[PDB]
Structure 1
Amino acid sequence: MQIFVKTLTGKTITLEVEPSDTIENVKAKIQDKEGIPPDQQRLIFAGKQLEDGRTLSDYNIQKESTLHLVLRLRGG
């Protein structure tokens, strides 16, 4: 099913994911379609930072939901 991911530059990317897939699968999809490394990625949904080991079904992410991607550059 379809979700949106909005990043800090206002770029919105559409993702085709199933709720059975885990969060690092979504980070791997962002790596494929946008090139942002998954260790720098940080995902926020409804004011909750997504953990790696969970899936979309743990965070109640339904159709056409909007994720927020921020780039965590450790040093710069």
Structure 2
Amino acid sequence: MQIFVKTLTGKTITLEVEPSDTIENVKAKIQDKEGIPPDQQRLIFAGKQLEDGRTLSDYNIQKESTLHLVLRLRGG
């Protein structure tokens, strides 16, 4: 199954997933392709913040769905 991830820049990538994949797994795939550490990643789908322990199927994320990637910023 394939899904899309886009940033506000408009850049879109395609990920190979299965519905059982955790959000953690998806962040790990983004790290693989984009070099962005999981701790810096916030993913959103249909306005919902996706939490690390849950799966794509928990959020009813289907084939060809688009997730939004927003970077996280933490103080020193």
* Bin of the TM-score, shorter chain as denominator length: over 0.9
**How far does the alpha carbon of each residue in 1:31-69 deviate from its partner, in whole angstroms, 9 at most, with x for none?**
000001100100000010000010011000001000000
Question: Using the alignment, how far apart are the partners of 2:15 and 2:7 within structure 1?
Answer: 13
Which structure carries more helix by proportion?
2
Question: Using the alignment, how far apart are the partners of 2:65 and 2:75 within structure 1?
Answer: 31
| Aligned-pair CA distance for 1:10 | 1.1
| Aligned-pair CA distance for 1:73 | 1.5
Instruction: Tell me the SS of whatever aligns to 1:39.
Output: helix
Unaligned regions of 5+ residues in structure 1, if any? none
Question: Using the alignment, how far apart are the partners of 2:75 and 2:5 within structure 1?
Answer: 24
Aligned to 1:16: 16
**How far does the alpha carbon of each residue in 1:10-44 deviate from its partner, in whole angstroms, 9 at most, with x for none?**
11000000011101100000000000110010000
Question: Using the alignment, how far apart are the partners of 2:28 and 2:74 within structure 1?
Answer: 19
Question: Using the alignment, how far apart are the partners of 2:11 and 2:27 within structure 1?
Answer: 16
Moved over 3 A (4+): none
Q: Give the alignment's TM-score, normalised by structure 2.
A: 0.95
What is the total number of aligned residue pairs between the two structures? 76
